[PDB]
Amino acid sequence: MTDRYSFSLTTFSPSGKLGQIDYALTAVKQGVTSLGIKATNGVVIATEKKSSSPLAMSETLSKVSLLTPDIGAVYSGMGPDYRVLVDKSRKVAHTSYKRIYGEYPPTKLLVSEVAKIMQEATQSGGVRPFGVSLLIAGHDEFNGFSLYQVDPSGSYFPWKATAIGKGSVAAKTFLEKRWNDELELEDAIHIALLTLKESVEGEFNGDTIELAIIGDENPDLLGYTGIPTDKGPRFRKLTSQEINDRLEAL
Amino acid sequence: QFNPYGDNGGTILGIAGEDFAVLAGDTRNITDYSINSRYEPKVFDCGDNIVMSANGFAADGDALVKRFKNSVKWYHFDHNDKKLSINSAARNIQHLLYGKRFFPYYVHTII
Amino acid sequence: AGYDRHITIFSPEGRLYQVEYAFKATNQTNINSLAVRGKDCTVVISQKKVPDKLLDPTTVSYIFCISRTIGMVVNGPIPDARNAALRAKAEAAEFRYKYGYDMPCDVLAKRMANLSQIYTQRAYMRPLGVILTFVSVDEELGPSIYKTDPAGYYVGYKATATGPKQQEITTNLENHFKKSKIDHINEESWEKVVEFAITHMIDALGTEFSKNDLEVGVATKDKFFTLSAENIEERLVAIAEQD
Amino acid sequence: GTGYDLSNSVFSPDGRNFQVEYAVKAVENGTTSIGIKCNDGVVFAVEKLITSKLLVPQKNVKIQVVDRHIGCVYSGLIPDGRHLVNRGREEAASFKKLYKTPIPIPAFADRLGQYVQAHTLYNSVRPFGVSTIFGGVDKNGAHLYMLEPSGSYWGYKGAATGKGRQSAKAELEKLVDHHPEGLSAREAVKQAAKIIYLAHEDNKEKDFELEISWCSLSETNGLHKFVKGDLLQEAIDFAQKEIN
Amino acid sequence: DRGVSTFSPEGRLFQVEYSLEAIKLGSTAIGIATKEGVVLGVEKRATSPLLESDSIEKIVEIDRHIGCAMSGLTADARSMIEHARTAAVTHNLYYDEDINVESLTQSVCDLALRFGEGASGEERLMSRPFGVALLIAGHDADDGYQLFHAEPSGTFYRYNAKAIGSGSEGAQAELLNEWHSSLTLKEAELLVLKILKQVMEEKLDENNAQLSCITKQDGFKIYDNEKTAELIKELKEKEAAE
Amino acid sequence: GSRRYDSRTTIFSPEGRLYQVEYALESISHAGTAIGIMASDGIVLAAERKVTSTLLEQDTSTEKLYKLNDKIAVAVAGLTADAEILINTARIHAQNYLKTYNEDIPVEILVRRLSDIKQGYTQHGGLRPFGVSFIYAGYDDRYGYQLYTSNPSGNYTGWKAISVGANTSAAQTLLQMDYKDDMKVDDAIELALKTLSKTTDSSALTYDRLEFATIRKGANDGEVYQKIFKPQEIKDILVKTGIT
Amino acid sequence: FRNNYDGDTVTFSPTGRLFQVEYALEAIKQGSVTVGLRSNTHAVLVALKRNADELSSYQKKIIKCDEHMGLSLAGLAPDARVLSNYLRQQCNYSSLVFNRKLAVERAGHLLCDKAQKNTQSYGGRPYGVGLLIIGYDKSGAHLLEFQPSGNVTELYGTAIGARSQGAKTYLERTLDTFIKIDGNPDELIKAGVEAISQSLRDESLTVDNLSIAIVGKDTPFTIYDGEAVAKYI
Amino acid sequence: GYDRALSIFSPDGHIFQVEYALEAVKRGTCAVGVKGKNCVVLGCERRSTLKLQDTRITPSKVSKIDSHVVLSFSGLNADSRILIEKARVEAQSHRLTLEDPVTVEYLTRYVAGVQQRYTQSGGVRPFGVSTLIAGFDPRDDEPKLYQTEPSGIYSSWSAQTIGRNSKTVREFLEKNYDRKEPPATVEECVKLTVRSLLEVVQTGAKNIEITVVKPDSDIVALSSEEINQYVTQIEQEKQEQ
Amino acid sequence: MDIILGIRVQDSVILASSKAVTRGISVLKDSDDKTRQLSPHTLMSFAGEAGDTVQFAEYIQANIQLYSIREDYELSPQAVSSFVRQELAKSIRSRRPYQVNVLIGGYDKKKNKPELYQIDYLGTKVELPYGAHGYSGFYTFSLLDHHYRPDMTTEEGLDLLKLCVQELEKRMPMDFKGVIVKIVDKDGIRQVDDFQAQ
């Protein structure tokens, strides 16, 4: 017994490449297309619910996850790797921030915390890098709205809009045409549904699509009243109905 | 509160002659005002022509004699059956006793 | 270089061969299993094959009672099956002690899937060559079917199948639900839901079953239990008086 | 490629663990041992190859007791079998300490099962080179078990492993068919003695010693005891008569 | 690769055997035991004329009654000498007596096999065996004058005379003929000087060679260059005599 | 066992080179070029952003220029994630020193400590080295304006002008050509931009592909000020220097 | 084949063999010959000591474990020191805790289990020494043969080392004779010396070459070397 | 955690990791040390692969372990710091317990001990560094000069050199250093040092640095001019013939 | 307790420390130097628990000397005092705290100004024109509150200390066997060998 793998499984090759990171990025490239667009008053993250069986319930699998009431995350690549990262990201938001400052971390710092976890899986003994790229969308009082991409290497960069996975190349190109610095949240959702349609082969509706937003505070989603400073979460996942309504105006 | 120590009474005596040595001791073992045994040996032959008695708290006395007897056994194992000299036996017992400096063998020992 | 197929590290294609070969181990037993949801119950059927005459057939099982409420059926070798069973039981007992309520089927599934994901990432731990189908009538979600694999993947099912002839059973069940337009078996008694599961098990596999060819576990409100040979025989008599 | 059989916890492309299968080859090479479940107990018997006249007869005991009600016998790497019984004894003592009652046989079976399966999970450990036949009498009847290097085990009516496992299994199968009502503890000892002698024909070059033990509710009070003296010779003769 | 405590098909330990090859490349060391004392002699073997020869320390004191000579990877011997010196002094503290030469040697040899990447026996934290052989020579009241050959294998032999290093096989064959049970201390001193001269690549003088002895009376003493020079002069004269 | 899969990251080549260090340096030679130039009245840090898009947010972006202290800043070439690990430990070390001595950490002490951490991964642990090269720009009341550089080997040196990452050979030749000891910050700002503009692998040198920082002792104060240039500020200085 | 499966003890061969164990067993066959034999009152160890040079000593082969137990070695001497020292502690523990002399059969079980742990774990190596344990306990005289594989067998007589088959064949023939040498130590030792000399080839057993040990009814485990074995040559 | 045996024996009886650690020393810049009658002098060559350095702040080749002892080296710069630091700590620890500064032999013996330890410990590679340790024992005027290497072997030299082309400069010193009459002046000691370096450095006024250690903590490093003056005088000795 | 006095004048810091070491009934030594030189321009005096007093001082000395060699630089009196304070602040919450009170007198070569720091065993640091530890301060602070000026010369400071020692010799119960006086200025640390009758 005992983990005797105390040495790195990712090492530098003669060419300077880090093999396992490259291959993790290859695993991301095979994954289903996910995207993110930043508007003036919100951010939208969307992906396709690739149901692996019609007998399976696609609702019981959320590719878009809430990290903090103001921060959401979506991915492309290995599902199980994403799920455990979400659990770790939710916890690190508390342990490394909320339990110290009494407030949730700003988007950039939580992204930096996630990036650190993924970086260590690149260097630590007896592990492989995470086979996922993440798109984290959030809001904080002093930075406004932001969108970040986190790669298997642990490197992260901010975006106005971007797509990852299968048809990222084609999707990024389409986003470059449609994006401007004056987009309203609804316009970004519209562009998000357009960009995602080119990536979807089969059925394209509110049950095959998973979409969430980082917009205004939702006092109806808070669960309580009586504290004026608490106005609800900014993260909201759109219902199957809410998607279909916008698909008629496609 | 629990007291780890007791007193089993008794008395031991050692006199060295020119070519001999005696180690005596009464066979009485007591607790407070009761006699535990009228015959409980206190002076022991530890081999290598060495006699030893650790009088006071019998449980500590027995434990020390037992550990020294075992020290003589291992002295033969480690040094090609060499005889443990009386001066070497004494110094060995010092380390056995000072080993429990902060939880002492409550005994007066004579070899 | 060529050791990317020995431990759980990425291949140049971004694949994990050890996880893929662990998937191959799940079919070693040549056993097919299916799970369906009733109106207020969940039923698991699994093929029971006892080749050796020297075996005690009462000890041959791939269905496990994890908790009072949760049951689990395994596809794969029995040593890995019992490894996953004991862990699930230990996790189920601990959850109840710490959080004051019975662990839900989907949560145990996620917990076991997370554990399986760790063997997918860590080099010294091998994946378990098993597929775990968890069933219960959850106090919040009702009848539940949640299935985990060596990849660490898990999801909820309206109904599911696992084994060598999984696809034949899957399409059979698919076609019924396309027809019925509902996501469950519209039946009040579990006895008929078991009968349904056995019926479509026969149709898809094209094979007749005796009382000792099958293995049934039923999940109901506040209890999961397994059927005896005679409980199954009674079920086999009822399906015979229809065909 | 290849090399899937060099490390313990590695899956081969066909989902197999070759190191475990290699451990089985060490078992198959070993002496033959059996287990017979009777109407109120279990009987264990093993072949003991007499390498030379220098081996002190009746001294080199192979069958081992766990607790006071379980008997264990194995074929293959003897030191590995002892290691498993040593663990089994710790495992049984741990159960009794917490639950007061002596460990049930199915409970004890899984305890060995999980421990053997554990040695197929890491490349830092080697799989067990033994197949172990074990069992006894508990709260609700008698139980017989056989444990493979893979960690796999089942309940058995009759069990056999080692050199002459096929000859044994064939004889065990006849008994199951001809006795649907169940063999008696007395009869199982005789029958075990015969099966060993018959299964010895797969090793007939070397002379052997017979060793029998049993755990019966009526005959031994549900405690594991070795078959000795008159009852041993009676069984030895029963076999030596039906070998001709 | 392959484990550091792996067995060869012949039943030998690879690392231990390869360690013996490292000693074969070491500078020559000769020990001769007599009823008058044990003599230890080494080849300094300076790698350059600019190297101050007296800084070469290949004969060391373990205790007043025990000294040793080294051959092979001399840097590996430092922790062995440290262990030996401690074991000698520690025994004296516990028993108010001198440690037996055989017991000291056994304690040094106990370290030898304490190597591996995780050998299930204790906590052998050492990546490789020692690359040095030792000639432990001393005196005790029980067994008189003694000479021991400690190897990285863990095994130690008691020799009347022993040569280790580059010119060991030739020097040992010489000791075979030259040694007898009635040799005097002076006869042994000259005999070490003679055989060293034969196996040394350089012409033996009081700078590239060092003598030492252990006697019951004065204990272990390293001969200063002036004392050795005269013994070399005495040796040359007795050789030229016939 | 596990030995089979061990790369042995901390071993010497037959030539006496450290494989992983050499390969980590090869990795950095592809990363965006970073330049540091030290003048008489301050220091200039300049870095070329490797890989950009129209949709890349540059305002909220920082991938090469990081603030360690109020007096010390770094330029990064290589793995951004690896760099942030080392940056954080460096930021902690600076605060430990300030808490201990009630004085700001001298530039070399901080640089040496980071270089020692890098050296660690080179000699022991069996882990890969950090694929990062730092250019330290700092000031203390002992040596004044200081410019250091560190690489995966754990070796650090002081410079008047230096470059790390891509095209260092071409950049160093151009720097050694136009550098003068009596230079001013504004001259150095220009030199830094000119050198990058000639070593760039891209078409033109635009503001969106640059990070800029200066460490000056603003005459109208008496204290050291760190200025990490904003996108608009980079756009301005890019026009003024005659690059538009 | 073999080369791919003999790297460590943790690896089985395709045939189910442990080559590292088998290689450790080969170190015994290279070792000097030693013989064990017993009656009903005594147990005797006769060992041939091996020397390097004619200037070296003949390395000891017999180790005392307790007043009633001891063993002879064949193979790696340091490994014999390790195992004998472990056995010394187990005999010692039995006395101090239970006031009970350690049964020879139990001593064999303990040596078996300790050797086994070095045959299943990574990083470790099998012990490279064979052992012949003799002892007089509560059930009379005993003789055990220990193999690094973990296999311990109780025998009337046996031999391990180089050419050991000669002595083993003799004892297998002399069985009915020596088993009855009760109450006569000198005759049992002579029977052991006649056994060991059936494995000679190079030389003849001399005074500083022969090593004999004995334990029994009223005989504590005592080793005889040199002058003390002259009356047996 | 990581304890993989990196330094191990080969079939021929070599430890390749220690052997290759010496190759790293052969790569390192040349370092030389000569002892006079009343001083020791340490000389080090400076590389020229890149020239635009800040000489004030760039770590110098000769390091002070204590006020009376100095250490120069050849090989990996990063590795040398770890040895220097450990030596500097032991220097103070010795003063704290013995109430007397280290002897040059003792300090050398310690550095060599650390180096040796890394040749038979798990999960570590040997130091790719050889050192020259020079100075004066407390209250002593007899010059001391020692050399260490990756293996952990150490010894004292009248004159020694390590690093690239140490083969060439050693030859010079072997046929230019007389033990009968060691450089009886600080000046003629520095001259013999510069002369030995010029055999390899190939015209390097800024490529040669000199440090002079005298008894009683008297250590001083020469400036470019002071050294350049020696070079000028030496180049004349050749041309005047 | 032992007498530990410190006074900062115009260009120097002067430390006065009692020479007596008393254990129970006997005065074991009358020539004890209760000070250590941490660096050429920094001096630290100490008083407190028998063993802890010297052990802590030598420990601090070793660390500053190690820093001096590593950096080839002398830490400012402030930096040294901050290091000493943190060491005592750690100590107070440990298993067995250092019961040592210190005065740190150093000349800052950068500022060209003398500095005097008073730190107790708790880690309470304060900078003062004049400082004392133990019962000494009870007689001396009012004296120095009266006769102290910041422009006083080193000679004026030595006359001022003489006035303090005289008061401590009159009103204090313990015979502290006089004091050893040391001056810390731009030229380092020197000892006034003539204070027995200055």
Curated annotation (Swiss-Prot), chain B:
It comes from the Eukaryota. It is found in: Cytoplasm; Nucleus. Belongs to the peptidase T1B family. Non-catalytic component of the proteasome which degrades poly-ubiquitinated proteins in the cytoplasm and in the nucleus. It is essential for the regulated turnover of proteins and for the removal of misfolded proteins. The proteasome is a multicatalytic proteinase complex that is characterized by its ability to cleave peptides with Arg, Phe, Tyr, Leu, and Glu adjacent to the leaving group at neutral or slightly basic pH. It has an ATP-dependent proteolytic activity. The 26S proteasome consists of a 20S proteasome core and two 19S regulatory subunits. The 20S proteasome core is composed of 28 subunits that are arranged in four stacked rings, resulting in a barrel-shaped structure. The two end rings are each formed by seven alpha subunits, and the two central rings are each formed by seven beta subunits. The catalytic chamber with the active sites is on the inside of the barrel. This is Proteasome subunit beta type-6. It comes from Saccharomyces cerevisiae (strain ATCC 204508 / S288c). The chain holds residues 20 to 130 of 241 of the full protein.
UniProtKB/Swiss-Prot annotation, chain C:
Keywords: Acetylation, Cytoplasm, Isopeptide bond, Nucleus, Phosphoprotein, Proteasome, Ubl conjugation. Pfam families: Proteasome (PF00227), Proteasome_A_N (PF10584). It comes from the Eukaryota. It is found in: Cytoplasm; Nucleus. PROSITE patterns: PROTEASOME_ALPHA_1, PROTEASOME_ALPHA_2. SUPFAM superfamilies: N-terminal nucleophile aminohydrolases (Ntn hydrolases) (SSF56235). Its main location: cytoplasm. One of its GO terms (cellular component) is mitochondrion. GO terms for biological process: proteasomal ubiquitin-independent protein catabolic process; proteasome-mediated ubiquitin-dependent protein catabolic process. The modification Phosphoserine is found at S228. InterPro entries: Ntn_hydrolases_N (IPR029055), Proteasome_alpha (IPR050115), Proteasome_alpha-type (IPR023332), Proteasome_asu_N (IPR000426), Proteasome_sua/b (IPR001353), Proteasome_subunit_alpha6 (IPR034642). There is a cross-link at K223 (Glycyl lysine isopeptide (Lys-Gly) (interchain with G-Cter in ubiquitin)). Belongs to the peptidase T1A family. The 26S proteasome consists of a 20S proteasome core and two 19S regulatory subunits. The 20S proteasome core is composed of 28 subunits that are arranged in four stacked rings, resulting in a barrel-shaped structure. The two end rings are each formed by seven alpha subunits, and the two central rings are each formed by seven beta subunits. The catalytic chamber with the active sites is on the inside of the barrel. Interacts with CIC1. Present with 15200 molecules/cell in log phase SD medium. This is Proteasome subunit alpha type-1.
UniProtKB/Swiss-Prot annotation, chain F:
PROSITE patterns: PROTEASOME_ALPHA_1, PROTEASOME_ALPHA_2. GO terms for biological process: proteasomal ubiquitin-independent protein catabolic process; proteasome core complex assembly; proteasome-mediated ubiquitin-dependent protein catabolic process. The keyword Nucleus applies. InterPro entries: Ntn_hydrolases_N, Proteasome_alpha, Proteasome_alpha-type, Proteasome_asu_N, Proteasome_bsu_CS, Proteasome_sua/b. It comes from the Eukaryota. There is a cross-link at K99, K198, K230 (Glycyl lysine isopeptide (Lys-Gly) (interchain with G-Cter in ubiquitin)). It is found in: Cytoplasm; Nucleus. Keywords: Cytoplasm, Isopeptide bond, Nucleus, Proteasome, Ubl conjugation. Pfam families: Proteasome (PF00227), Proteasome_A_N (PF10584). Present with 17100 molecules/cell in log phase SD medium. Belongs to the peptidase T1A family. The proteasome degrades poly-ubiquitinated proteins in the cytoplasm and in the nucleus. It is essential for the regulated turnover of proteins and for the removal of misfolded proteins. The proteasome is a multicatalytic proteinase complex that is characterized by its ability to cleave peptides with Arg, Phe, Tyr, Leu, and Glu adjacent to the leaving group at neutral or slightly basic pH. It has an ATP-dependent proteolytic activity. This is Proteasome subunit alpha type-3.
Curated annotation (Swiss-Prot), chain I:
Keywords: Acetylation, Cytoplasm, Nucleus, Phosphoprotein, Proteasome. The modification N-acetylmethionine is found at M1. InterPro entries: Ntn_hydrolases_N (IPR029055), Proteasome_beta2 (IPR035206), Proteasome_bsu_CS (IPR016050), Proteasome_sua/b (IPR001353), Proteasome_suB-type (IPR023333). One of its GO terms (molecular function) is endopeptidase activator activity. Its main location: cytoplasm. The modification Phosphoserine is found at S76. It is found in: Cytoplasm; Nucleus. It holds the Pfam family Proteasome. The keyword Signal does not apply. GO terms for biological process: proteasomal ubiquitin-independent protein catabolic process; proteasome-mediated ubiquitin-dependent protein catabolic process. The keyword Acetylation applies. GO terms for cellular component: cytosol; endoplasmic reticulum membrane; nucleus; proteasome complex; proteasome core complex, beta-subunit complex. Belongs to the peptidase T1B family. The 26S proteasome consists of a 20S proteasome core and two 19S regulatory subunits. The 20S proteasome core is composed of 28 subunits that are arranged in four stacked rings, resulting in a barrel-shaped structure. The two end rings are each formed by seven alpha subunits, and the two central rings are each formed by seven beta subunits. The catalytic chamber with the active sites is on the inside of the barrel. Present with 21800 molecules/cell in log phase SD medium. This is Proteasome subunit beta type-4. It comes from Saccharomyces cerevisiae (strain ATCC 204508 / S288c) (Baker's yeast).
